[PDB]
Amino acid sequence: TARALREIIRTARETFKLRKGKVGEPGDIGHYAALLDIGKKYQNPYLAMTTDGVGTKVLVAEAVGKFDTIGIDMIAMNVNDLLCVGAEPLALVDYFAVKEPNEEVFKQVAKGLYKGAEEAGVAIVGGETAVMPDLINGYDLAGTAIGIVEKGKVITGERIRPGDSVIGISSSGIHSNGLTLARKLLIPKYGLDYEYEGRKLWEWLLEPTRIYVRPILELINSVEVHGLAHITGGGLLNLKRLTNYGFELEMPPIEGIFKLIHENGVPLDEMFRVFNMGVGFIVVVPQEEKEEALEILSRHYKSYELGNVTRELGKIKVKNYGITL
Amino acid sequence: TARALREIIRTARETFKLRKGKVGEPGDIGHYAALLDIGKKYQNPYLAMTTDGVGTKVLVAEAVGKFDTIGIDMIAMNVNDLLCVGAEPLALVDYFAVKEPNEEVFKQVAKGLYKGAEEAGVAIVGGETAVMPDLINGYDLAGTAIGIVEKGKVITGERIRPGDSVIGISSSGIHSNGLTLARKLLIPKYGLDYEYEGRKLWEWLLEPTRIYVRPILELINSVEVHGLAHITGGGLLNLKRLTNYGFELEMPPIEGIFKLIHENGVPLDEMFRVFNMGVGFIVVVPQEEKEEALEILSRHYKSYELGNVTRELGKIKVKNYGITL
Numbered sequence: 001t002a003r004a005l006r007e008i009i010r011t012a013r014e015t016f017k018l019r020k021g022k023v024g025e026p027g028d029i030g031h032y033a034a035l036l037d038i039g040k041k042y043q044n045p046y047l048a049m050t051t052d053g054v055g056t057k058v059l060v061a062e063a064v065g066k067f068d069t070i071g072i073d074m075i076a077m078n079v080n081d082l083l084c085v086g087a088e089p090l091a092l093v094d095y096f097a098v099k100e101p102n103e104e105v106f107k108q109v110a111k112g113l114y115k116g117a118e119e120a121g122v123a124i125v126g127g128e129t130a131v132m133p134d135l136i137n138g139y140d141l142a143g144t145a146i147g148i149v150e151k152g153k154v155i156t157g158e159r160i161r162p163g164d165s166v167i168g169i170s171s172s173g174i175h176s177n178g179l180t181l182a183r184k185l186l187i188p189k190y191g192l193d194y195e196y197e198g199r200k201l202w203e204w205l206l207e208p209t210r211i212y213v214r215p216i217l218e219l220i221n222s223v224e225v226h227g228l229a230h231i232t233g234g235g236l237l238n239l240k241r242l243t244n245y246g247f248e249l250e251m252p253p254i255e256g257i258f259k260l261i262h263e264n265g266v267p268l269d270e271m272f273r274v275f276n277m278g279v280g281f282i283v284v285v286p287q288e289e290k291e292e293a294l295e296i297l298s299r300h301y302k303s304y305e306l307g308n309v310t311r312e313l314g315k316i317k318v319k320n321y322g323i324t325l
Numbered sequence: 326t327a328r329a330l331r332e333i334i335r336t337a338r339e340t341f342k343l344r345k346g347k348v349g350e351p352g353d354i355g356h357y358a359a360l361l362d363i364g365k366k367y368q369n370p371y372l373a374m375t376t377d378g379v380g381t382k383v384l385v386a387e388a389v390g391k392f393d394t395i396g397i398d399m400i401a402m403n404v405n406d407l408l409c410v411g412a413e414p415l416a417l418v419d420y421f422a423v424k425e426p427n428e429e430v431f432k433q434v435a436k437g438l439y440k441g442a443e444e445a446g447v448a449i450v451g452g453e454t455a456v457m458p459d460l461i462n463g464y465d466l467a468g469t470a471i472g473i474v475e476k477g478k479v480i481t482g483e484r485i486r487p488g489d490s491v492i493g494i495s496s497s498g499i500h501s502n503g504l505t506l507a508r509k510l511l512i513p514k515y516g517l518d519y520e521y522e523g524r525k526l527w528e529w530l531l532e533p534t535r536i537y538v539r540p541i542l543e544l545i546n547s548v549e550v551h552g553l554a555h556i557t558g559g560g561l562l563n564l565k566r567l568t569n570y571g572f573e574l575e576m577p578p579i580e581g582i583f584k585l586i587h588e589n590g591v592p593l594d595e596m597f598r599v600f601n602m603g604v605g606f607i608v609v610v611p612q613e614e615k616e617e618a619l620e621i622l623s624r625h626y627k628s629y630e631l632g633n634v635t636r637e638l639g640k641i642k643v644k645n646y647g648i649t650l
Contacts, residue, residue, distance in 0.1 A: 027371055030481045031566045032409035032555060033472070035371040038363065046352060047361040047372065049471065051418040051453045059459055084357035093376045095420055095467050128376040128467065134505070135381055135463050142420050142453065144469040146374065147358070156355045180459075230357060241356045 004101040005129055008094075011110035012124040015117040023148055024090030026125045034125035036091050036146065044151040048087035052077035052232075053142030057179045060205045062138045064192060067105050069208040070141055071112030072119075073176045076209035078145035079120040080230040080281065083216045086155035087147030089120055094127035097140040101131050105139060112208070119211045157242030157284075159226040162311040165290035166247060169215065170302040171280030173207035174257050177233050178275040182257065185264050196260055204257040212281045215300040219283065223293050227284035231276040236316050236325055239282060246310035248317045252278040269323050284309060329426040330454050333419075336435035337449035340442040348473060349415030351450045359450035361416055361471065369476040373412035377402035377557075378420075378467030382504045385530045387463050389517060392430050394533040395466050396437030397444070398501045401534035403470035404445040405555040405606065408541045411480040412472030414445055419452035419468040422461045426454075430464060437533075444536045482567030482609075484551040489634040490615035491564075491572060494540065495627040496605030498532035499582050502558050503600040507582065510589050521585055529582040537606045540625040544608060548617050552609035556601040561641050561650055564607060571637035575645045577603045577629055594648045609634060 019025045023042065027035030038045065054073045061070045071094075079089040094113070098105075117124050122145065130136075174182065182205060186194075192202040212230070219225060227242040239247055251272070254262055258277055262268065271277060285293045290305065297303040307319070316325040344350045348367065352360035363370065379398045386395045396419075404414040419438065423430075442449050447470065455461075499507065507530060511519075517527040537555070544550060552567040564572055576597070579587055583602050587593065596602060610618045615630065622628040635642075641650040 027479070029483075030410040030479050032406040033373040033375045033412060035373055035410065035474070035479065037476070038370050038372055040369075045363055047363055047471070048358040049361065049416070049418060049450065049469075050358040051420055051451060051469065053420065053422065053453055053455045055455065056457055056459060081357040085355040085360060087358065091374070093374055093469055095376055095378065095469075097378070097422070097465060097467070125374065126376060128378055130378050130380060130467070132381055132465070132505075134384055134508075135465055136460065137462060138460050140422060140455075140457070140460055140465075142422070142455070144374075144376065144418055144420075146372065146471075149360070151362075154352070154355055154360065158354070180457075 001101040001131060004103040004106040007107040007110040011114045015123045018121055019123045026123050042148055042150055045148050046151055048082050048085050048147040048149055050078050050081040051144045052081055055176050055179055057176050058139055058141060060202060064202045067108035068111040071109050072116035072208040074141045074143050075116030075120050076211045077176050078143050080212050082145050082147040083212060084228040084230055085149055086153055086220055087149040089122045089145055089147045089213055091123045091125045092143050092145040094143040097130045097132055097136045099133040099136050099138060120213050155225055155228055157227040160243040160245060160284050160309055162245055162309050163287055164226055164284050164309040165287045166306045167283050167293055168279035168304040168306045169281040169297055171276045171278055172210040175209040175276055175280055181274060182261055210280050215297050219296050222296055223285055223289040225285055229282045231280050235273045235275055237273055239316055244313055246312040246315040248310050248319055249307040250320045251318050252304055268321050272323055326426040326456055329428040329431040332431040332435045336439045340448045343446055344448040351448050367473055367475055371474050371476055373407050373410050373472040373474055375403050375406040376469045377406055380501050380504055382501050383464055383466055385527055389527045392433035393436040396434050397441035397533040399466045399468050400441030400445050401536045402501050403468050405537050407470050407472040408537060409553040409555055410474055411478050411545055412474040414447045414470055414472045414538060416448045416450045417468050417470045422455045422457055422465040424458045424461050426456050445538050480550055480553055482552045485568040485570055485609050485634055487570055487634050487636045488612050489551055489609050490612050491631045491633060492608050492618055493604035493629040493631045494606040494622055496601045496603055497535040500534040500601055500605055506599055535605050540622045544618060544621050547621055548610055548614040550610055554607045556605050560598045560600055562598055564641060569638055571635035571640040573635050573642045574632040576643050593646050
């Protein structure tokens with residue numbers, strides 16, 4: 001157990017230098033709890049806290065025997081959520097509930113934790129490993145991330161108004177939602193090795209979740225932002241968390257694993273409420289800032305002018321697919 | 326799933342008044358992340374973060390169908406850990422991984438979460454519920470607690486010196502560690518209804534973990550404290566996390582569930598490395614403060630003068646049981 005944990009512990013320590021000299025630097029003293037130096041850079045700060053797991057994507061990792069990217073998924077889900085209040089991610093703790101202390105599994109998990117932490121700019125400051133074979137049939141990974149945002153700079157969605165521009169940033173793929181549906185629909189029929197548009201089914205299902213920290217932090221530092229939505233459970237329904245105004249959108253072509261799922265009988269109205277459908281993060285900006293917002297985001301990832309916020313209330317119209325959510 | 330989650334969300338919203346006006350008050354704005362007001366009460370603050378779970382105690386809860394105390398266990402484990410750096414607990418998020426969105430189970434879990442939050446003085450500000458029947462055989466409950474400690478007031482263990490007094494605070498019972506051993510040893514032999522000293526075996530195994538926030542916060546604000554150890558996994562071995570110095574201890578009588586376990590053949594040296602054996606929390610203070618520390622702690626719970634820190638580096642001698650760990 002401790003021997004398996006050594007790989008995670010040593011990797012976590014290597015991420016401390018990501019917050020060296022910055023807000024959130026780990027104190028690295030004492031025991032039982034991690035310490036983060038809040039500092040005085042932020043005059044009147046709010047602390048932002050999120051909690052997110054990977055989901056049954058970890059069952060795909062276990063099936064194929066490739067565990068070196070689920071740490072990226074866990075970190076991505078948490079830090080991408082933190083962005084949605086306008087916070088800069090600082091640090092993360094992991095909850096790792098496992099059926100056995102398999103040292104090879106833990107070593108691989110640590111590799112992805114390090115890569116995800118590097119990309120998100122966060123230190124992994126502690127966590128808990130619970131070996132519970134009676135309770136866990138596999139390797140469950142979740143976490144809690146902490147960020148910081150100035151009072152007065154919190155982005156809630158309250159400033160969203162009709163006419164605002166809606167911009168989508170491409171996902172890397174399926175990310176970490178809808179895997180239960182995808183696993184049940186596709187794996188018995190096709191097999192994990194099935195080749196679809198140049199990639200095996202398991203590669204489509206295990207593609208690591210994209211991390212949006214760098215584009216979004218650059219965006220909020222450069223333009224006024226009215227809303228930020230990480231596209232997770234519920235798909236486009238997450239936009240309704242930001243505002244009661246409506247949306248009229250043109251969504252990107254249905255491609256990759258989403259096309260295969262649709263071709264296996266899942267209707268589009270359901271797909272847009274389950275899968276990210278190619279858009280992993282959506283920003284809402286005053287229409288005056290649309291061009292500059294799209295240019296900042298496009299420097300990092302393929303991004304899309306999706307549409308507008310509408311005076312019509314509550315509805316999400318995906319116009320090029322004839323769908324209303 | 327939304328029906329079942331409503332039970333916990335409603336209860337968590339009711340805990341917000343526990344931090345109303347105090348440091349750590351939650352903000353009623355935003356989504357995706359919880360927001361905590363750090364305030365001006367602290368001049369140079371460290372943010373303290375812990376992650377801890379209930380363990381397979383939740384399998385006893387599921388066996389008997391009584392879930393309204395495992396939330397106390399989860400909150401207690403986290404806030405008791407936070408105390409060990411000298412931090413005042415502020416807020417908590419829960420990670421709830423379940424085999425199904427059972428509304429009666431969630432309703433019961435919420436009751437214990439509320440009771441634990443009230444006893445610990447923390448707000449429950451968010452969390453994740455993950456419905457994953459292929460991965461979770463039961464209802465797994467864990468969480469992360471956040472607290473605050475002034476930079477100069479961190480209790481590190483660095484100040485522990487030979488001659489320091491070692492004081493134990495009684496546990497409420499088995500707490501949340503050693504349940505795998507207790508379940509495997511006792512349940513098939515005796516049955517959950519087996520009556521021992523007036524309590525059924527499941528009542529012994531499910532007894533909620535004690536919360537030490539009140540005595541420890543009073544202690545640190547009154548006397549010089551050199552070390553604080555919540556007795557969790559590893560039992561007395563947790564004392565070795567605080568210092569390289571040794572310990573000479575007299576442990577309390579073996580009673581209750583620990584006596585039944587001992588009489589079923591578990592050796593005492595193993596027992597002191599697995600179970601809390603009646604001592605849930607240990608403090609280390611200068612010898613001159615021993616009587617004051619005992620008086621403060623004894624206002625709240627039965628407490629023990631256990632012994633002294635020794636120059637015998639790295640050893641824990643339990644001399645009244647002839648044991649060295």
